[PDB]
Design a protein around this ligand. Structure first.
Ligand SMILES: *[C@H]1O[C@H](CO[C@]2(C(=O)O)C[C@H](O)[C@@H](NC(C)=O)[C@H]([C@H](O)[C@H](O)CO)O2)[C@@H](O)[C@H](O[C@@H]2O[C@H](CO)[C@H](O)[C@H](O)[C@H]2O)[C@H]1NC(C)=O
Length: 144
């Protein structure tokens, strides 16, 4: 019951290079890393995770962020994976799966991938399952 005052601007605005959407900060990193190594990068900077896409509007924001970067990349990592290889999907942040956006023929049963990327052919709006050892660029999400 000491400092009962209003939030400073650092808790309402996101830092240079990152963009705000509904109380979180987001950024696209063009470094090509495995899914696990990408999630670790996100954890190391302001205690985030690979992005979790929980609504259609959040998916539209993330797609716009990637397009605005000017990247020529085909695949971008998001935080969804199948850890027990039994087609039960989880977000690395622990959030519930409240939204899905699978592309045509996904998730595959005939040549299954266990990690998920956004595809450039769909304007970064639809998802594909791919091997977790692939090296792709990625989007991080962190609270602030
Ligand atoms: C809210 O502000 C607390 C500091 O407040 C003054 C101060 O005494 O320094 C209150 C003054 O009215 C104000 N003066 C003017 C003219 O605005 C100043 C200035 O706003 C400030 O100097 C910037 O120039 O602030 C701030 O430190 C407090 O923080 C927290 O304090 C708690 C401790 O009791 C606990 O440590 C919190 O975890 C910590 O964030 C600020 N509150 C929040 C939620 O950020």
């Amino acid at each position: 019951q000491e400092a009962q005052t209003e939030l400073p601007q650092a808790r309402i605005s996101c830092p240079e290079g990152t963009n705000a959407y509904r109380s979180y900060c987001y950024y696209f990193n063009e470094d090509r890393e495995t899914w696990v190594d990408a999630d670790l990068y996100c954890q190391n900077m302001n205690s985030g995770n690979l992005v979790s896409v929980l609504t259609q509007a959040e998916g539209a924001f993330v797609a716009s962020l990637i397009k605005e970067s000017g990247t020529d990349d085909f695949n971008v990592w998001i935080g969804l994976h199948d850890p027990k290889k039994n087609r039960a999907w989880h977000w690395s942040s622990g959030s519930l799966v409240s939204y899905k956006s699978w592309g045509i023929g996904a998730p595959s049963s005939v040549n299954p991938g266990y990690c998920v990327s956004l595809t450039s052919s769909t304007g970064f709006q639809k998802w594909k399952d791919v091997p977790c050892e692939d090296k792709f660029s990625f989007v991080c999400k962190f609270k602030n």
